[PDB]
Design a protein around this motif. Structure first.
Motif, mmCIF file in Angstrom:
data_model
loop_
_atom_site.group_PDB
_atom_site.id
_atom_site.type_symbol
_atom_site.label_atom_id
_atom_site.label_comp_id
_atom_site.label_asym_id
_atom_site.label_seq_id
_atom_site.Cartn_x
_atom_site.Cartn_y
_atom_site.Cartn_z
ATOM 1 N N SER A 1 -12.868 28.599 7.010
ATOM 2 C CA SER A 1 -14.500 28.096 6.753
ATOM 3 C C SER A 1 -15.674 29.241 6.336
ATOM 4 O O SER A 1 -16.887 29.383 5.875
ATOM 5 C CB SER A 1 -14.967 27.205 7.410
ATOM 6 N N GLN B 1 -20.953 29.731 13.435
ATOM 7 C CA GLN B 1 -19.398 29.997 13.036
ATOM 8 C C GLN B 1 -18.501 30.151 13.844
ATOM 9 O O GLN B 1 -17.426 29.250 14.142
ATOM 10 C CB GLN B 1 -18.804 30.786 11.573
ATOM 11 C CG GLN B 1 -18.061 30.376 10.923
ATOM 12 C CD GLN B 1 -17.494 29.074 10.787
ATOM 13 O OE1 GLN B 1 -16.474 28.845 11.733
ATOM 14 N NE2 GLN B 1 -17.798 27.804 10.136
ATOM 15 N N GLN C 1 -11.217 27.451 10.635
ATOM 16 C CA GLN C 1 -12.780 27.438 10.823
ATOM 17 C C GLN C 1 -12.807 28.687 10.210
ATOM 18 O O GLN C 1 -13.998 29.096 9.540
ATOM 19 C CB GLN C 1 -12.488 27.689 11.803
#
Lengths: 343, 102, 115
Positions: free
Chosen positions: A46, A27, A43
């Motif tokens: 996320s 990630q 991101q």
């Protein structure tokens, strides 16, 4: 050890669960590619941290805002973790808080030696190191007034009793010396508290990690030795925390050392720090070894030291977030991978 | 020099950012009001270019070097050196601008 | 004129002052005034910035360079007014916390106009 569940089993479980939401290496890599500020925010949304990226408008969305959100998450999670606990875990959290409270009190010292309109400091004080008497010290102007506001009704009184005669600071830099002096007193208090009130394996883990931090402070002081006309080696030995792994074989020799040759030579007497004084960078390898030690302490899985492990591991994670956000949003891709992500 | 004040100034700003990361916090508050005269100054300009006494400022470092250095971790000295290099670039850009005005 | 030192006052970002005072800075111990007045990063009205600019670039006799953050693209008119001479303050527009050196810089604007 089995008793630990009776007092901090729930705290340990929830802290471990908080640990499980750390930055996934894949990630983090995906976020690194998303160099755009909006893309990086998406991101990070996320990421397990949640919808913090959408809290603020994209206009002000920057690396500074990202670090501010990370600091807010740190402060709130740590507040919950200390509020849900009591007893030895409560005191451990209190101490953790005092670690940053030393720096916050040092910032509060700024504005006393030279008038500085302490309102900005109060609005900018680091939240994790909040002090109850911080507004009281803010109002105090004279050195003795601030000293009383800090030696009385402020928990850091033992540190200001072990040193800081009259707190004149007319020839002693706050951040360089006074902050380092209170930091050393705090380090000694932490070490003896761990040795006298924390059970093993957390006892040994805390001793090792506190030694690591004290060694880091000593190495920073030694590096800063050559750039100062003050800070005599007689004071440098006083400047050292007088505790830690390198003490006394490497700490005393480094303190007596004044030339740059003494600095590196001293770290060679200890096997763990070999090469840091001769290659790479001080701070980066400091954070690398600290993250490794935090992971090692988190491996024990049934110790008070796990709280400190998660603290310092995701402090390194926040430092990595700052590194990545700066290097991506403002486009310096060369050292984007300098961040540590072995958690 | 303007596109340098983009790129190289970004590099020096990230030198400051790395120093802050080492210190874990913005050291700007500590640096504020640190010293009366930091280790740098602008000398009186003097030159004659193409028959015109264009005044290009030949700034030089202050003899009392590092009057506000030695604070925090080890990255402070490196940040000070990077700032001095960027300030040399700034003296160059200011001299070029003074020429481009006179 | 005489020697002096630089200053940076433009309300866009004062982090440039933090990133530059490490090597180059200016305060007036005789006058008890920090010549490198911060920009407050947008926490002050433009009137205070204009007053400080007038004091530095029209009241100070000692001559040196001066810097300005992304507000240099905001106060371009005042910059053109005070930039009539390279002394006492030859202005400049560093990027500061964001890349903010476009064709909108007053010195770059004059260079392009005469280009």
């Amino acid at each position: 050890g089995v008793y630990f569940n009776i007092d901090n089993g729930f705290i340990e479980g929830v802290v471990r669960g908080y640990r499980n939401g750390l930055l996934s290496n894949n990630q983090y890599i995906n976020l690194t590619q998303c160099d755009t500020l909006e893309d990086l925010k998406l991101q990070l949304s996320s990421t397990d941290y949640g919808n913090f990226l959408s809290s603020v408008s994209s206009e002000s969305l920057t690396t500074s805002l990202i670090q501010e959100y990370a600091s807010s998450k740190l402060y709130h999670e740590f507040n919950y973790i200390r509020d849900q606990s009591s007893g030895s875990t409560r005191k451990f959290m209190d101490y953790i808080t005092y670690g940053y409270m030393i720096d916050n009190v040092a910032l509060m010292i700024t504005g006393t030696i030279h008038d500085r309109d302490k309102g900005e400091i109060l609005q900018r004080c680091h939240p994790l190191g909040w002090f109850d008497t911080l507004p009281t010290l803010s109002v105090a102007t004279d050195l003795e007034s601030l000293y009383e506001t800090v030696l009385v009704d402020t928990p850091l009184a033992p540190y200001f009793k072990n040193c800081f005669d009259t707190a004149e600071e007319l020839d002693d830099m706050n951040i360089e010396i006074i902050r380092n002096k209170l930091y050393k007193a705090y380090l000694e208090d932490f070490y003896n508290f761990v040795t006298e009130e924390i059970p093993e394996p957390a006892k040994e883990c805390m001793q090792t990690l506190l030694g690591f931090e004290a060694d880091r402070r000593s190495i920073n002081i030694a590096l800063n030795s050559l750039q100062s006309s003050d800070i005599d080696p007689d004071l440098k030995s006083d400047l050292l925390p007088n505790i830690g792994k390198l003490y006394p074989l490497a700490t005393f020799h480094l303190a007596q050392a004044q030339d740059f040759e003494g600095v590196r030579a001293a770290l060679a007497n200890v096997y763990e720090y070999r090469g840091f004084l001769e290659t790479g960078n001080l701070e980066d390898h400091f954070y690398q070894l600290e993250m490794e030690l935090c992971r090692d302490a988190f491996t024990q899985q049934f110790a008070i030291s796990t709280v400190w492990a998660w603290m310092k591991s995701k402090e390194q994670e926040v430092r990595n977030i700052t590194w990545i956000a700066e290097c991506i949003a403002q486009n310096q891709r060369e050292r984007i991978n300098n961040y540590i992500s072995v958690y | 020099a303007k596109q340098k004040m983009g790129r190289v100034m970004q590099t020096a700003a990230f030198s400051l950012a790395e120093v802050s990361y080492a210190t874990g916090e913005n050291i700007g508050y500590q640096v504020q009001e640190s010293v009366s005269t930091a280790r740098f100054k602008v000398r009186a300009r003097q030159e004659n270019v193409s028959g015109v006494y264009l005044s290009q400022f030949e700034s030089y470092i202050d003899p009392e070097i590092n009057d506000f250095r030695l604070t925090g971790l080890g990255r402070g000295g490196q940040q000070v050196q990077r700032a001095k290099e960027i300030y040399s670039r700034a003296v160059e850009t200011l001299v070029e601008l003074a020429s481009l005005q006179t | 004129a005489e020697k002096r030192t630089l200053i940076a006052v433009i309300a866009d970002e004062d982090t440039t002052t933090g990133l530059l005072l490490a090597g180059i800075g200016q305060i007036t111990p005789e006058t008890q005034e920090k010549n490198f007045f911060v920009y407050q990063e947008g926490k002050t009205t433009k009137e205070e910035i204009t007053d400080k600019f007038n004091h530095f670039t029209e009241e100070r006799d000692d001559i040196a360079i001066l810097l300005i953050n992304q507000h240099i693209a905001e106060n371009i008119r005042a910059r053109v007014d005070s930039f009539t001479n390279a002394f006492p303050a030859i202005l400049e527009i560093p990027s500061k916390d964001h890349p903010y050196d476009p064709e909108k810089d007053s010195v770059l604007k004059r260079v392009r106009k005469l280009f």
